[PDB]
Amino acid sequence: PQVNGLSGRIDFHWLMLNPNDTVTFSFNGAFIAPDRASFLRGKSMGIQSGVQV
């Protein structure tokens, strides 16, 4: 179904590389490759709300 004008869809997958391990991507098409990785800075708490801060 049309969402933002496109009837195609991208499926986002994820894994968590442990330190010193290696991830490998074989692909001959239909790939959305990561440019940058992401690391967690510490601890926090998330909530869901609709009120003033």
Place this chain on the structure above:
Amino acid sequence: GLFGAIAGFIENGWEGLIDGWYGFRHQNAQGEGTAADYKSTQSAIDQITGKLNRLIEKTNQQFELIDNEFNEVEKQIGNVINWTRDSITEVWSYNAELLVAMENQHTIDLADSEMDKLYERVKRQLRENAEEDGTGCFEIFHKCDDDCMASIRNNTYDHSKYREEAMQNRIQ
């Protein structure tokens, strides 16, 4: 109460006594007089305080989101979560209502004890000088001036220095 002196033989309370929780009200030659007893009143207040200091300013544990209000989680896991949470709510609701009944039952009897402890202590000071009618009163059988009354309050009453006089009026 459990010790029957908050409803047993003290018929009613004294709305005028705002000095404390428990107290004395005497009658003698010089006239009327009302004073509160600190050592008792504070003994119950220090006790209610213990309860409050136990139920208030608890440092509860940190919990995180497992649900999603904006993008509902999968159904089968959403039900195990809704189910589990509903069950814990039963426990705490039960634990909350039961704890208060336990505590409120205790506090209400606890106050009795402080009344009976005061009453049954004053009676021992007046060993054979007085008799108790049974309304929470002590019929004194000697001249007890307003200094003799205050003697009872701070526990300086020397039963011996009135005994022979009191025992006389007691038997005639």
